[PDB]
Design a protein around this ligand. Structure first.
Ligand SMILES: CCCCCCCCCCCCCCC(=O)OC(COC(=O)CCCCCCCCCCCC(C)C)COC(=O)CCCCCCCCCCCC(C)C
Ligand SMILES: CCCCCCCCCCCCCCC(=O)OC[C@H](COP(=O)(O)OCCN)OC(=O)CCCCCCCCCCCCCC
Ligand SMILES: CCCCCCCCCCCCCCCC(=O)OC[C@H](COP(=O)(O)OCCN)OC(=O)CCCCCCCCCCCCC
Ligand code: SF4
Lengths: 60, 37, 74, 449, 397
């Protein structure tokens, strides 16, 4: 549950931050869902982080 | 396997307290960072 | 490396694009390089767009421009 | 060869490993004092270097306009790559059910935490305006500005921070049963209640072990993708750039293989003295050293394969820039790094193939030191040589390191060893449980023959 | 064993039907048959190369899963010499056998004389630059050398395992196989990477990827592991697979399949991000070809069906412990591997998704049917789960 929540939170964070709140042309990269590369690593890291905290705290 | 605390009067109250704490914190943070200006 | 392009005037009169048509024949085997991009960019079709052209034939390497930039941009 | 020498008892494992910490302060061995004094002196060098870096700026290093990334990034990559081997031992071997991780998981994971601590300073130290490090992290501000999230340094911030937190929580979860043994054997009321709060009343029992084992497997499962992703991201920053040496598709896996290879050499270099100085010969056998050497050889061959792929790419393409990259690596002003790289990580690993060389303890120590130097040279070749010469010949310059970046490097070594010495003084080097459980598993195997 | 014979018969039927439709396609167009054959050979080669790699890796690292599938891996590896004979038609295409058999132009661009010769009508310089390395004689010699290395390693290891049954298995033979496996793994990785570069990366000489070949090894590993799971369901009852097996080997193979699926996705994403983020004209065309004329839909299908659906399904302790559920996922993964390789090889020739010919589907089914028939013929030569083995104790836990 928390891993999926973290992955979704990371993806939504990147989307809202860089494609909705402040739209900033950087290097001509797309401002749409076609910018899905360069968005994966933050999603993965957030999912792993929240999953690990959930595992440890839930065990305790 | 049941949780260690299963069958306790205090379980619902503690869960409630944690949720209320969380909501209060969230609203206050939201206000300071979004609406206080 | 293709940093500076030099061509004769008589050939230039017959074809202005001869210098650009050449080089690409040595490098890719074709007159025009078919560069392909995975990144969209921005249209810029109806807005002011700022660009600079520097003429190699005109430049004498005086270095006046370098001093002018230092005074203007601190 | 066996991974556990016979004649061990659950009480003996508790007493032997338990005795190292909990010894009275005035009874600390003199070797510990000497090592700690050396580490503290190097830490003072670190403090002086950081202070002068903050006062004067990043201009005290050897970095210049073409080479904007100098030995700071090289040392950052080196330190972060040291911590892959311990994470491997702690997590992947747990998933693989390998039985030689029991005696070396605690020390290796401590090395990972301390190496990540050392390597986390470089992103802030090299920053040029170091006090503005928080800008990379998403944070509520009145400006409304955000990190780009498409650069690879934004990914680095999430990878290193996640890696440090997950490693710390996993290490603490492993220590909770060990803390319970220490509080029981502390023998002092004040020493007790310090281990006891950390133990959190562990009271090891069924229905606590069942959840503990499942959580450890899940954490080990999450960590294995995490460590590969961390090193792959520390490789993506070079790969994302259009610099000719930097943009190589094989960079992510090759970097992961390089990190395990460098880390295993460091673990062999430090584990062998700890095994000889204390009576840990029974817990860490020659078979442990032999298997670790084989893993180091296996990852070293992948690094050599990465070199072969890079050379084949240079010869395959018709680009002038790849050819000049190869020429500058081989016959350039910095060819010494490439030649030392070819000697250290290809020629030195070849003796490891023979069983006799792996068995010999002196041979392992010499090869491990050569591998550690060679990996530093590999990072130097990848970064500095590629940055020195580029597309425009007019923008070509040489990188010459100063004394201050070297001072930072020795200072980071001192900080690392200080943290290791405090760890071995206060906490147990070998997991007390999972070693008596290993004895239980070995006795059961003997019964079923 | 009767189930094994049924599998062999089904593989033979798939082979004859596939070759027969491929022959009909050849009659209408020889060029279409040859392009389809190259894709079919590349997808078929994965099961034997994967079987050899796993067999050597399991000898290096002893495991309950390794003892359970050791005989099956040996049988799949043993088919490698026949696979070398199957390469001969591809060699004819890039040699002077062109201008005959109906081929208008040589199968490979480097083979064509005008492209690699100065003063040639096309004379592409980049292809001409690699002419000594990319020449018909050199390519054939390297592929033949790789076949000799693969055949020697596979046959020698199988012979030592058969000898293990007769005698001296306590430390002898097992140590010898482990030593041959350790030197072999390094030789196998180098040979497979170069074989992948010559057979597939050389189709477009303008583009090169360093990670390529490592990605093929991950693709081969997933295909072989999925194939092993399908076979295990068929041989679940075989007497030696009744008193000597437990849920633990099946669970370990399921974990390995999950790890290989994530590893393949990581290698594919890693290549994509490096090429996409570094927008250099030299590496951009390969992605442009695979995202145009409907190829984007195949890429999206691989992202969703090939990666997300298996990752979520195999995220549970059940569905890896249960053989039937592991088999259904394993059949789906094999179909996805066929789609993934079609996306990797077909865009070089088809240029459009709707242009795919029946021969493109026919060549993989026919060649893999031959592979399955040979595998089932070989596996019945010797008993499964060699009883005489110092690792037989891992099966008894
Ligand atoms: C290109 C991106 C790659 C993404 C990699 C994704 C794979 C990594 C998954 C982590 C391990 C989960 C093990 C679960 C478990 O403990 O399974 C047990 C059975 O127990 C159960 O019944 C269920 C347990 C609950 C699992 C929930 C996990 C949370 C959801 C994941 C969130 C991910 C993040 C990114 C949002 C038995 O199974 C095992 O333990 C087997 C472990 C095998 C390790 C796999 C190693 C991955 C290798 C590929 C990694 C590639 C790199 C690029 C990251
Ligand atoms: C280092 C980074 C990446 C790792 C990639 C591999 C994924 C590892 C995690 C999956 C584990 C699978 C479940 C456990 C299992 O089945 O293996 C355990 C096996 C047998 O152990 P016994 O139960 O019999 O107990 C014996 C001792 N009591 O142990 C093994 O022998 C390990 C199996 C072989 C590992 C294969 C991985 C090879 C990696 C190839 C990398 C290719 C790179 C290409 C660029
Ligand atoms: C597509 C086909 C597959 C091809 C795969 C090619 C790549 C395979 C790489 C495998 C490397 C293995 C190195 C050798 C490790 C070793 O020596 O094995 C030791 C052990 C323990 O077994 P014991 O007690 O000594 O004896 C067993 C018999 N009784 O087995 C292990 O494998 C665990 C050791 C740790 C594994 C190290 C390798 C990790 C590689 C990481 C880098 C990957 C790069 C991407
Ligand atoms: S100012 Fe002098 S140096 Fe500058 S562009 Fe003009 S001629 Fe050249």
């Amino acid at each position: 549950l928390f891993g999926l929540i973290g992955a979704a939170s990371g993806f939504i964070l990147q989307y809202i931050g860089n494609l909705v709140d402040y739209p900033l042309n950087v290097g001509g990269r797309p401002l749409d869902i076609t910018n899905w590369p360069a968005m994966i690593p933050i999603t993965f890291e957030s999912g792993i982080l929240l999953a690990s905290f959930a595992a440890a705290i839930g065990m305790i | 396997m049941q949780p260690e605390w299963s069958g306790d009067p205090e379980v619902k109250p503690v869960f409630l307290a944690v949720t209320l704490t969380g909501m209060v914190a969230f609203l206050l943070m939201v206000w300071l960072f979004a609406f206080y200006w | 490396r293709d940093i500076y392009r030099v061509g004769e005037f008589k050939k230039f009169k017959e074809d202005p694009k001869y210098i650009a048509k050449e080089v690409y024949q040595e490098e890719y085997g074709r007159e025009t390089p078919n560069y392909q991009s995975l990144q969209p960019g921005d249209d810029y079709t109806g807005r002011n767009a700022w660009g600079m052209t520097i003429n190699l034939n005109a430049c004498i390497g005086c270095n006046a421009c370098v001093v002018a930039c230092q005074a203007e941009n601190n | 060869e066996a991974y556990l020498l016979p004649g061990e008892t659950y009480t003996s494992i508790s007493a032997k490993i338990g005795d190292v910490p909990l010894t009275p302060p005035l009874k600390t061995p003199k070797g510990w004092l000497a090592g700690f004094s050396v580490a503290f002196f190097m830490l003072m060098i670190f403090f002086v270097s950081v202070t002068w870096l903050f006062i004067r700026g990043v201009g005290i290093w050897g970095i210049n306009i073409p080479v904007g990334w100098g030995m700071d990034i090289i040392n950052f990559v080196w330190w972060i790559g040291i911590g892959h081997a311990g994470t491997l031992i702690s997590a992947i071997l747990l998933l693989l059910n390998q039985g030689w991780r029991n005696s070396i998981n605690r020390f290796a994971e401590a090395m990972t935490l301390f190496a990540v601590a050392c390597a986390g300073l470089y992103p802030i130290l090299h920053l040029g305006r170091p006090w503005l490090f928080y800008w990379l992290i998403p944070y509520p501000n009145t400006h409304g500005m955000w990190p780009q999230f498409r650069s690879a340094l934004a990914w680095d911030v999430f990878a290193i921070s996640t890696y440090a937190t997950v490693s710390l929580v996993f290490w603490l979860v492993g220590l909770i049963p060990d803390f319970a043994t220490l509080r029981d054997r502390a023998k002092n009321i004040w020493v007790k209640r310090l281990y006891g709060i950390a133990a959190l009343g562990w009271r090891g029992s069924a229905r606590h072990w069942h959840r503990y084992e499942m959580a450890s497997i899940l954490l080990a499962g999450l960590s294995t993708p995490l460590v590969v992703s961390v090193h792959s991201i520390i490789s993506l920053d070079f790969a994302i750039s259009q610099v000719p040496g930097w943009q190589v598709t094989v960079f992510p896996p090759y970097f992961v293989a390089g990190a395990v290879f460098a880390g295993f050499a460091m673990v062999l270099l430090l584990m062998i003295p700890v095994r000889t100085f204390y009576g840990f010969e029974n817990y860490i056998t020659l078979h442990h050293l032999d298997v670790m050497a084989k893993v180091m050889l296996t990852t070293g061959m992948i690094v050599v394969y990465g070199y072969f792929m890079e050379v084949f790419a240079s010869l395959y393409s018709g680009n002038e820039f790849e050819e000049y990259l190869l020429y500058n690596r081989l016959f350039g002003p910095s060819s010494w790094a490439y030649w030392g790289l070819l000697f250290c990580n290809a020629v030195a690993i070849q003796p490891l193939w023979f069983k006799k060389v792996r068995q010999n303890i002196p041979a392992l120590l010499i090869i491990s030191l050569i591998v550690s130097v060679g990996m530093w040279l590999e990072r130097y070749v990848i970064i500095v040589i590629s940055l020195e010469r580029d597309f425009l010949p007019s923008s070509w310059d040489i990188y010459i390191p100063t004394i201050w970046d070297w001072s930072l490097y020795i200072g980071t070594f001192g900080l690392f060893f200080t943290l290791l010495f405090l760890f071995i003084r206060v906490l147990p080097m070998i997991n007390i449980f999972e070693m008596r459980l290993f004895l239980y598993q070995e006795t059961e195997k003997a019964k079923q023959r | 064993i009767p189930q094994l014979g049924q599998v062999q018969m089904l593989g033979l039927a798939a082979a004859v039907i596939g070759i027969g439709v491929l022959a009909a396609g050849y009659f209408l167009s020889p060029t279409s048959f040859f392009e389809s054959y190259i894709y079919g050979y590349y997808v078929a080669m994965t099961i034997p190369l994967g079987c050899l790699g796993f067999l050597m890796v399991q000898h290096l690292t002893g495991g309950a899963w390794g003892v359970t599938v050791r005989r099956m891996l040996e049988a799949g590896a043993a088919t490698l010499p026949i696979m070398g004979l199957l390469f001969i038609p591809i060699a004819l295409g890039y040699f002077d056998t062109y201008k005959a058999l109906g081929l208008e132009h040589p199968l490979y661009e480097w083979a064509n004389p005008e492209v690699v010769t100065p003063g040639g009508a096309e004379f592409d310089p980049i292809i001409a630059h690699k002419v000594p390395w990319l020449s018909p004689l050199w390519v054939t010699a390297r592929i033949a050398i790789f076949f000799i290395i693969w055949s020697a390693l596979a046959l020698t290891l199988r012979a030592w395992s058969r000898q293990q049954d007769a005698g001296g298995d306590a430390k002898k033979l097992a140590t010898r196989m482990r030593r041959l496996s350790g030197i072999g793994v390094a030789l196998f990785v180098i040979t497979v990477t170069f074989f992948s570069f010559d057979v597939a990366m050389s189709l477009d000489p303008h583009w090169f990827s360093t990670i390529y070949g490592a990605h093929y090894m991950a693709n081969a590993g997933l295909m072989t592991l999925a194939f092993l799971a399908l076979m295990m369901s068929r041989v679940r009852d075989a007497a030696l697979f009744r008193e000597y097996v437990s849920v633990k080997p099946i669970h370990d193979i399921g974990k390995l399949i999950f790890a290989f699926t994530v590893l393949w996705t990581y290698m594919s994403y890693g290549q994509l991000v490096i090429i996409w983020s570094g927008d250099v004209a030299e590496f951009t065309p390969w992605y442009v070809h695979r995202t145009q004329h409907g190829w984007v839909f195949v890429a999206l299908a691989l992202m969703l069906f090939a990666f997300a659906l298996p990752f979520f399904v195999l995220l549970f302790r059940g569905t890896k412990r249960n053989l039937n559920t592991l088999a259904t996922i394993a059949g789906w993964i094999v179909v996805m591997r066929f789609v993934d390789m079609a996306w990797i090889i077909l865009p070089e020739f088809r240029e459009h998704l709707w242009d795919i010919a029946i021969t493109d589907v026919a060549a993989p089914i026919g060649l893999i049917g031959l592979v399955i028939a040979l595998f089932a013929a070989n596996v019945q030569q010797a008993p499964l789960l060699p009883l005489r083995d110092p690792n037989m104790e891992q099966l008894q836990n």
